């Protein structure tokens, strides 16, 4: 519910230098046509999607991956820190540790690293090769900023760790590291703003579990759905459309009755109505750190959440 | 403020053993052959009162044996030692024990070994009897149960000299002091703290006699008034999390307890005034904390600590 | 042939390695019971030392009465009784309002899993009250902990609580408190034919109680009922156990009223099957591995009317 003021200083720099900047890998050089897949600089779709919106003749660049998206993930990691500490058997990562092993100081550093997580993006390109390049860019920006301003806070091995977290390196598991796990999970929660019911509730494949089943399996239905409703309220606080949910429709989405019944068993019946986007709240979230943070601190957190610092 | 999962899988595996092998079983020194009267001291095989107190309680048709010295009581003491491990690090000159060490000299490994030992501390009980001879028999039973388990399953973690030392902590032989070793000191303190669930205001705040300090005053003089009081409130909150009655506190009532103005006044400048309301017992939470390690642990990891537990 | 879900067999493997293959621990001299000296040992009843293990080809097979072969047989019984309830106009209505036919093919899998744990908490063959309820509460909590960590993707939390309470068989829950518990209890009851007398199997103890197969007749009729009876007897045989002879002729000579043996021959009809005696290596192969136990049981033909649903 609260963020350290030094986290917000780094937030201000990241907004000015990156999250407010236009996408550059845009335009005709970066259109994609799958039958001539190498005719351009793009080798997959998405470079020209929602490059910006205009709110009251101000231009808001990278609206899907801007200040508000980035700051919401920092509230997600602070909440899931407490949720993980309420579990008897928090998930153990490939490094031997759980989210409950992170200190209150570790979560400050992790918040700083989340500021850079998508800061290296140059379009909304989605395909694998663009994704790993943009994350490399974010990781390099993080290393540079931290090694110059944040050595009083980050040791050298922590800079390497959190940069490897931002990089999302080829061959690292989702849960390679407790730090990187909490970071991927915070990013995952925010995908609810724009993914289909199938991705949010059923999992896009037979193996995959889906965003909300993942929260329920990690924190139980009670805490997990608390978190899902809290993120949905963070959407609204920052003007984004809040999708409706209807577990009635899931049997009609094209998925084998197999995966649907499993998804309804995990999640339970859910019928909650949507909300519409709001241009003014969008603009206050997107254009200033003070604007975004002030809209986010005033949203109530779950009853069980008692933030430490 | 949740403390979170602080005990590693190895410690929980031991806790499952201690529950399955000892803390879940009926007390056995309990029938007519263990009643007692000081006026026919050796009519039965008991030599003091208490063998038939609180053998079990029934909660929603489930029978919970040894509710006073069961799983919930044992687990809570592991949480107190973790909290007091941090508190001793906020202290200039923590107490130096007969081994020449303090609580602040404990490593994270020592705390893990100590937690394992605490799992057995009262696991050798065969009744609620706490008169001299039954007390020392039951703690020696606990020590031997710990030695048997450790020598078969924990030799990659306890050296042979460590199994002897921790066994000695559990035994609590006559002649042994509170503070022979830093580890045992901490074990005794965690046990002491849980006594607030069932002891009178005089033992908790003023002291049994003119000599002994009493439970909360002992916390206060080891950790300061502020850390001390936080530990007290934390323990009280753990009673509620495992469904146990939490006694009220009324520092106003202490002159009206029939003990000298001498002793009562000193207890109110150490502790300061205190008015905290009690809370009844809860049977659902009591059963959930009593019949499984998962239920008891899951209930306890949730509970807030003071913020200073988290800062290092 | 009848089939089990691969995820049920995976849990069946876990339950063999972790419980069903482990020796009983409430055994030996400290659990022997002598009725003349009721307070001599830890036991408050008889049976702790009955049939701790048998020896096949100098291999020691622990808990042979309540091991892998009994447990897996009960899973096959509930599968068959599910379809058998599916064939009845007004199948029995349990205290929760549901019948066995109200369960889905997916519920049966969850029930199958819960059945694996039904006697897995036993620490001896003791069956007197206090021992029976401790053992079923052990098995219930061992189901809980396993489900809550490896099965949240298949069990809801309400479902875990429900199936745990079925395994627990709490005091004051009726045989038919839930449709789930009813099916679980009925499957255990079928397997008691392997070891109990003609009076329990056909006439009952008292004036109020039905026999084991008068019960299967009253629920599924006479053809469906005794079809189930013979399928069980045939699962005994495939798992090496002695198949007692049946003789309706002897039933008067049993020292119980013509009242009851009258009812039995009306309900069951006349019936006389010759017995068959046990087989060590069919007992050993059904006792020592999931693969050996499953492989033996899938090869027994099901009755004509049984068409099992499972494909996913």
Residue numbers in the entry:
A (entry chain A): 3 to 311
B (entry chain C): -1 to 310
C (entry chain B): 2 to 313
Please quote the authors directly:
Here, we describe identification of two bacterial effectors that reverse PR ubiquitination and are thus named deubiquitinases for PR ubiquitination (DUPs; DupA and DupB). Structural analyses revealed that DupA and SidE ubiquitin ligases harbor a highly homologous catalytic phosphodiesterase (PDE) domain. However, unlike SidE ubiquitin ligases, DupA displays increased affinity to PR-ubiquitinated substrates, which allows DupA to cleave PR ubiquitin from substrates.
